[PDB]
RNA sequence: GAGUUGAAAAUAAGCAGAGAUCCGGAGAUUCCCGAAUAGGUCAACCUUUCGAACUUCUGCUGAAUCCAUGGGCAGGCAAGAGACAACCUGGCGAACUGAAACAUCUUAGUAGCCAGAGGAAAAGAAAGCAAAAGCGAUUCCCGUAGUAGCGGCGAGCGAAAUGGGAGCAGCCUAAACCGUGAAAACGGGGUUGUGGGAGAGCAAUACAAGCGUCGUGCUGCUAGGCGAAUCAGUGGAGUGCGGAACCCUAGAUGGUGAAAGUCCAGUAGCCGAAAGCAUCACUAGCUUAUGCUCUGACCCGAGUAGCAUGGGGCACGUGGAAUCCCGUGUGAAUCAGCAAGGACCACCUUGCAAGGCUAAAUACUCCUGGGUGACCGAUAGCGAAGUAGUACCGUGAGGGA
RNA sequence: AGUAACGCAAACAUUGGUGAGAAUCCAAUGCCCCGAAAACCUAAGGGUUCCUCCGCAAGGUUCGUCCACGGAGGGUGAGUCAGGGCCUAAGAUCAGGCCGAAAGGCGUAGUCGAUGGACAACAGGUGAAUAUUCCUGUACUACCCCUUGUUGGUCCCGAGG
RNA sequence: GUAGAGAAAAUGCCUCGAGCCAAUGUUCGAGUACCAGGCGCUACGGCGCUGAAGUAACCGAUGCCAUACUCCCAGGAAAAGCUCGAACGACCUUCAACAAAAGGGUACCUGUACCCGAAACCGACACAGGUAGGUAGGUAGAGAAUACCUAGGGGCGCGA
């Protein structure tokens, strides 16, 4: 029942909110990748959950863009654009808990 | 003049793949205050410096890349003298 | 191990080809063929490629296990081997009879299984929830 | 190529025969010339390769008929 | 409709009757190389001012030069480009071989190579056959027929018309003339052959026939589902054997410890599609259309036909050599014409070249789905039942277990 | 046929050690050979053969505890060294252009193309396996930053080199 | 400096300059570096500790100055960085650009292991063979020949 919920949640947001959300997620994915190698116990299931969550987000993004009427080429140009302007920020998830500590 | 294009188009969150933990690296940490990170082959030094400078919030002196015979980039990140290595070692879960 | 040609058959998309078979996990069955013939039991594991089922007290095989850990200590264990799904018939405990199995529709908007030598329904509405909690 | 633009003539594939009947591959060619022709409606010359039959046809029908049937624009020539 | 996270166990965690894994339809993403296409390169990289290069398209701009051409700038999900077994069309086009040698001839317009397009291609709506009787576009099969012929009259090559079948389908345009212009163009009219059309007058008018967005329709395909009927005995196992029963619109098939109509998956039979695809019907609409009389003055596809030469191809080798198609050179006639009827001329018959386009019957298998097999069963069958175009060999084309 | 051979006529010897097993593996002591190499390093090439631990089926012309062999796990760090972000030679491709049954051939600007031009780093130390690369010392190029000083600078073009 | 269409250049006339060149050398770098030994441990492998003197003469290059000379005929690469500069064209313009001496800062990809007079490349082999370049110690010797040696590396993967 989580899938349906999450999708309803997704389809109701704005574009900037989606972007931001995506970034935060990718970062958490990073920190997760760190834990794997640290051999600190964690949940295998988490990679799947997160990665796929990101998938769903991007899907929705592109799907709206299609209604706007934009092509594949325009898509990929605006994509290079957005991946250029990406700056890393520390994941709010587990890095902010080592900024506070 | 224009926007500064990064050498390639990558997605920064995938470039630092992981710390390499073996007997070798740990004493590099001890001596040189330098972390050891397997990174994406397609990834450069300027991208690694921004990535780690922002991510763990440390100023980094110098980065040295490498390419294994297996085609996996490996990066020595030697931090400044101010920020200790072993700090980030306990922060990440690498135990010297 | 596996004889290279006895491996799992495949679809173009790499997933194995499953035999559709007539029994579920929690079921009680009686064994028609084999040395285990006549015995009654309940089903534990089921493999949908070979079409083979495993039943707790039946088809016991005596397996030697060598545990070498700092000493040599061996073990003689009795395990259960799979037995082909076409050797078993669904068993009714009530009128105490093994039958074939048809499908039938319930007014709930449901589709279930029944024994055709009685008309006794098999599947209980909470069955999956009954086995999950086990 | 050895082709006339205007009449679309091709070199023709023909045997040279001897008195002894022995045949041989040979080529007969279009008779081509590099001519300047007068174009009245452009008030100017046009450099071309032409078969001579083309030259004829240009005398008979005027240059523009020929060029229009052949689909070649005298400005771009 | 129950368990699941490829082969592929094990471990770790998840996801799951508010329906997972799974199956089908439509979308999404698709790094780098490759047509490769921002520029470069030693394919799978580098450099970047981040760009689909170039050719067509739309717009702006406007060299030598007045109009123009070229060039410059910009727009644009942007037409093409590449790949593709055999079949097919076009272009180039051999030789060994046969002739008991060989040169004309044969092999053969075959192989190969290049280019091109399709699911078929090509051909195709009589300037055709025929013979004094008739046919009525093209293609393909049978037959005529190894007949007529051709041929160092050697080796050899080899028709057609009548006749039988498969399959059927006929259409657009140029010119005369009338409109618009200075043109070049555009719009109407007009398309046929025992002649048509333009011209000039008088009649008929409504049905018929052909094409087709949109859409519930019909059917089929792409997931599926329901589906009859058996027991015990016999030495590892029974489907075999002996002994009892039953189903059949189902006794196809595969599996099962051992050969099964009745154990499993199935089969007959019967149900099923939100989405996409396909053949069909309908579908507003779009198209066309007749009839007679007078007029030889106007048109009826020109560097064409023919002629002279040089060849090619037609079964037909220059021969008496028609018909067909090409180099060089000359060069007509418009229906009171012109071409064909195997030199040529007369007469009659048949037809209307120099503008296009068109379905089916036929060819084929890199394949897809069903089916069968007096087909193979590990030296066989594909080169390959395991890393198979792999290992290995070769600078490379290539060889290849 | 258990025959020929075991790949130079630099040469081995002994004592210990490991080990089920030693002419062959390790160490020590002698002896002997090369030394314009049989030394150290770098181009090309090879491609993980390098290092450690385990192994001794096959490979090794005998042996084998060993190995360039097999199994697991590691290892190559650069503003200055070598190439690329610079320039051109031979040569290659070649927009337009000329020619050619087709494929293509010639050819101009352009662009490629080092074996050459241009261009900045050395000593010591660490070191199972890297070091002009990591560490400590002094260096040097190219950019950016500030102060000051001027107002035109940039490319195309003309030249010296 | 002038002159010619003439900025720089080339070219012609006028003028100012006795020094110039570059290996090498002195000094800093550079010493509490390095190192003979000495002390102590030995897992007896290696390790911690303290360290004297550190100059002179004579041989002498095939290396350096050096494209320096002298001679010869067979007459001995191009382009960029670099230095200089008016007109023509294009573009950019004020705290914008350029010019300078200090000061701080900043630092693109790819190779990097090992072998390389070879048991690892090329010779089908752990094959008496081939494979560009660099470095060039001692005694004798004309010598990079030869003989015997250092550094360093070896005793030729069958023996008796
Ligand atoms: Mg290190
Ligand atoms: Mg990448
Ligand atoms: Mg590097
Ligand atoms: Mg086995
Ligand atoms: Mg896909
Ligand atoms: Mg490119
Ligand atoms: Mg290219
Ligand atoms: Mg204009
Ligand atoms: Mg003008
Ligand atoms: Mg124009
Ligand atoms: Mg354009
Ligand atoms: Mg094509
Ligand atoms: Mg092609
Ligand atoms: Mg095709
Ligand atoms: Mg012949
Ligand atoms: Mg011959
Ligand atoms: Mg013969
Ligand atoms: Mg013969
Ligand atoms: Mg067909
Ligand atoms: Mg066609
Ligand atoms: Mg007709
Ligand atoms: Mg007709
Ligand atoms: Mg017939
Ligand atoms: Mg018929
Ligand atoms: Mg007909
Ligand atoms: Mg009409
Ligand atoms: Mg007639
Ligand atoms: Mg008549
Ligand atoms: Mg009329
Ligand atoms: Mg069923
Ligand atoms: Mg049944
Ligand atoms: Mg029985
Ligand atoms: Mg029986
Ligand atoms: Mg069974
Ligand atoms: Mg059985
Ligand atoms: Mg059967
Ligand atoms: Mg059926
Ligand atoms: Mg008439
Ligand atoms: Mg003619
Ligand atoms: Mg004559
Ligand atoms: Mg003639
Ligand atoms: Mg002929
Ligand atoms: Mg003839
Ligand atoms: Mg004819
Ligand atoms: Mg005839
Ligand atoms: Mg004739
Ligand atoms: Mg011809
Ligand atoms: Mg006429
Ligand atoms: Mg006729
Ligand atoms: Mg006509
Ligand atoms: Mg004709
Ligand atoms: Mg016609
Ligand atoms: Mg046609
Ligand atoms: Mg065999
Ligand atoms: Mg075989
Ligand atoms: Mg056999
Ligand atoms: Mg023998
Ligand atoms: Mg003998
Ligand atoms: Mg003997
Ligand atoms: Mg002997
Ligand atoms: Mg021998
Ligand atoms: Mg030997
Ligand atoms: Mg010696
Ligand atoms: Mg050596
Ligand atoms: Mg060495
Ligand atoms: Mg090398
Ligand atoms: Mg190996
Ligand atoms: Mg070794
Ligand atoms: Mg062995
Ligand atoms: Mg041996
Ligand atoms: Mg041992
Ligand atoms: Mg090894
Ligand atoms: Mg050149
Ligand atoms: Mg060329
Ligand atoms: Mg060209
Ligand atoms: Mg050129
Ligand atoms: Mg270059
Ligand atoms: Mg060089
Ligand atoms: Mg350099
Ligand atoms: Mg460089
Ligand atoms: Mg080393
Ligand atoms: Mg050093
Ligand atoms: Mg440094
Ligand atoms: Mg020092
Ligand atoms: Mg500097
Ligand atoms: Mg210059
Ligand atoms: Mg001057
Ligand atoms: Mg002056
Ligand atoms: Mg001067
Ligand atoms: Mg002296
Ligand atoms: Mg000399
Ligand atoms: Mg020398
Ligand atoms: Mg000289
Ligand atoms: Mg100016
Ligand atoms: Mg200046
Ligand atoms: Mg190195
Ligand atoms: Mg090295
Ligand atoms: Mg040897
Ligand atoms: Mg050797
Ligand atoms: Mg050798
Ligand atoms: Mg000497
Ligand atoms: Mg002497
Ligand atoms: Mg001497
Ligand atoms: Mg010597
Ligand atoms: Mg020695
Ligand atoms: Mg002996």
Q: Tell me the C-alpha to C-alpha distance, in Å, between residue C27 and each of C40, C96, C112, C115, C122.
A: 11, 14, 14, 13, 9
Q: What is the DSSP letter of C20?
A: P
Q: Tell me the torsion sign for CA atoms A56, A61, A66, A68.
A: positive
Task: Establish whether the CB of B27 is closer than 7 Å to any nucleic acid atom in strand F.
Answer: no
Would you identify the CATH topology of the domain D1-77? Answer: Ribosomal Protein L24e; Chain: T; (2.30.170)
The domain locations on chain A are 1-101
When scoring A26, A32, A34 by the number of chain B Cβ atoms within 10 A, the one with the most, hence best to mutate, is A34
Q: How many CA atoms within 13 Å lie on the side-chain side of C16?
A: 11
Sorted by sequence, the CB contacts under 8 Å of residue A47 that are 6+ apart come out as A29, A32
Paired strand residues for D35: D48
Q: What is the DSSP letter of B21?
A: -
C1'-nearest nucleotide to the CA of D16: E311
Measured from the Cβ of residue C60, the count of other Cβ atoms closer than 10 Å reads: 12
- Chain B positions contacting chain A at CB under 8 Å are 3, 5-6, 9-14, 16-19, 21, 50-51, 54-57, 91-94
Q: Tell me the C-alpha to C-alpha distance, in Å, between residue A91 and each of A42, A64, A84, D23, D52.
A: 17, 27, 19, 88, 83
Pairwise CB contact (< 8 Å): A80 & B9: yes
Residue B93's region, left for phi above 0, alpha for psi from -120 to 50, else beta, is left
Pairwise CB contact (< 8 Å): B19 & A38: yes
Sorted by sequence, the CB contacts under 8 Å of residue A31 that are 6+ apart come out as A91, A93, A94, A95
For domain B15-96, give the CATH superfamily. RRM (RNA recognition motif) domain (3.30.70.330)
Cα distance from N-terminal residue to C-terminal residue, chain D: 16
Q: How far is B94 from chain A (nearest CA, A)?
A: 6
Q: Tell me the C-alpha to C-alpha distance, in Å, between residue C51 and each of C44, C83, C86.
A: 14, 9, 8
**For A34-59, b where at least 16 C-beta lie within 10 A, e where not — what string?**
bbebbeeeeeeeeeeeeeebbeebee
> Distance between CA atoms of D11 and D1, rounded to whole angstroms?
10
Of B9, B12, B19, the CB nearest to A37: B19
> Distance between CA atoms of D71 and B67, rounded to whole angstroms?
62
Q: How far is the CA of A12 from the centre of ligand 45 (A)?
A: 84
| Residue B39 phi, psi dihedral angles, 5° rounding | -130, 160
Given the DSSP bridges, would you call strands B73-78 and C28-31 parallel, antiparallel or unpaired?
Answer: unpaired
Residues A36, A41, A45, CA angle at the centre, nearest 5°? 70
> Distance between CA atoms of C104 and C102, rounded to whole angstroms?
7
> Distance between CA atoms of C77 and B48, rounded to whole angstroms?
56
C1'-nearest nucleotide to the CA of B45: G108
Give yes or no for a contact between C78 and C63, defined as CB atoms under 8 angstroms apart: yes
> Distance between CA atoms of C97 and C75, rounded to whole angstroms?
39
The domain locations on chain D are 1-77
Q: Tell me the C-alpha to C-alpha distance, in Å, between residue A84 and each of B3, B24, B29, D77.
A: 9, 36, 32, 50
Q: Which helix (H) or strand (E) holds C69?
A: strand C60-69
Domain span including residue C98:
1-134
Of B16, B57, B92, the CB nearest to A38: B92
Task: Establish whether the CB of B72 is closer than 7 Å to any nucleic acid atom in strand F.
Answer: no
Per the structure, how many domains does chain C have?
Answer: 1
> Distance between CA atoms of B91 and B55, rounded to whole angstroms?
12
Method by which the coordinates were obtained: cryo-EM
Measured in whole angstroms, the distance separating CA C3 from the mean position of its chain's CA atoms is 24
Q: Six-digit token pair at D23?
A: 């045949």
Measured from the Cβ of residue A24, the count of other Cβ atoms closer than 10 Å reads: 14
> Distance between CA atoms of B96 and D11, rounded to whole angstroms?
88
When scoring A27, A33, A37 by the number of chain B Cβ atoms within 10 A, the one with the most, hence best to mutate, is A37
Q: Is A97 on the interface with B (CB under 8 A)?
A: no
Sorted by sequence, the CB contacts under 8 Å of residue A32 that are 6+ apart come out as A42, A46, A47, A50
């Amino acid at each position: 029942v989580k899938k349906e919920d999450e999708l309803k949640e997704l389809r109701t947001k704005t574009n900037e909110q989606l972007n931001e959300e995506i970034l935060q997620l990718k970062g958490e994915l990073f920190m997760l990748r760190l834990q794997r190698s640290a051999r600190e116990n964690f949940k295998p299931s988490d990679f799947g959950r997160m990665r796929k969550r990101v998938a769903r987000m991007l899907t929705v993004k592109r799907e709206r863009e299609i209604e706007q009427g934009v092509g594949k080429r325009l898509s990929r140009k605006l994509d290079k654009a957005w991946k250029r302007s990406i700056v890393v920020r520390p994941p709010p998830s587990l890095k902010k808990l080592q900024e506070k500590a | 003049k224009k926007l500064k294009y990064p050498r390639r188009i990558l997605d920064v969150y995938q470039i630092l793949q992981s710390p390499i933990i073996t007997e070798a690296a740990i004493k590099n940490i001890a001596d040189e205050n330098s972390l050891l990170f397997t990174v994406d082959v397609r990834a450069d030094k300027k991208m690694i410096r921004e990535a780690i400078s922002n991510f763990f919030g440390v100023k980094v002196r110098k980065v040295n890349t490498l390419i294994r015979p297996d085609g996996t980039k490996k990066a020595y990140i030697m931090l400044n003298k101010e920020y200790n290595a072993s700090e980030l070692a306990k922060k990440i879960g690498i135990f010297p | 191990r596996i004889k290279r040609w006895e491996r799992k058959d495949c679809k173009p998309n790499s997933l194995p080809k499953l035999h559709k078979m007539h029994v579920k996990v929690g079921d009680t069955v009686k064994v028609i063929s084999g040395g285990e013939k006549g015995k009654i039991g309940e089903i534990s594991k089921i493999h949908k490629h070979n079409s083979t089922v495993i039943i707790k007290d039946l088809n016991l095989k005596t397996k030697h296990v060598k545990s070498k850990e700092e000493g040599e200590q061996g073990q003689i264990i009795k395990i259960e081997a799979a037995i082909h799904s076409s050797n078993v018939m669904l068993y009714s405990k009530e009128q105490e009879v093994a039958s074939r199995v048809g499908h039938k529709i319930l007014e709930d908007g449901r589709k279930v299984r029944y024994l055709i030598k009685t008309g006794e329904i098999v599947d209980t509405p909470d069955r999956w929830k009954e086995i999950q909690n086990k | 190529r050895r082709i006339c633009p205007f009449t679309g003539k091709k070199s023709n594939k023909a045997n040279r025969v001897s008195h002894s009947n022995h045949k041989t591959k040979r080529l007969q060619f279009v008779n081509l010339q590099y001519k300047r022709v007068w174009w009245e409606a452009g008030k100017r010359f046009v450099k071309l390769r032409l078969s001579t039959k083309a030259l004829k046809t240009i005398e008979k029908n005027g240059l523009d008929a020929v060029a229009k049937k052949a689909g070649i624009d005298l400005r771009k020539e």
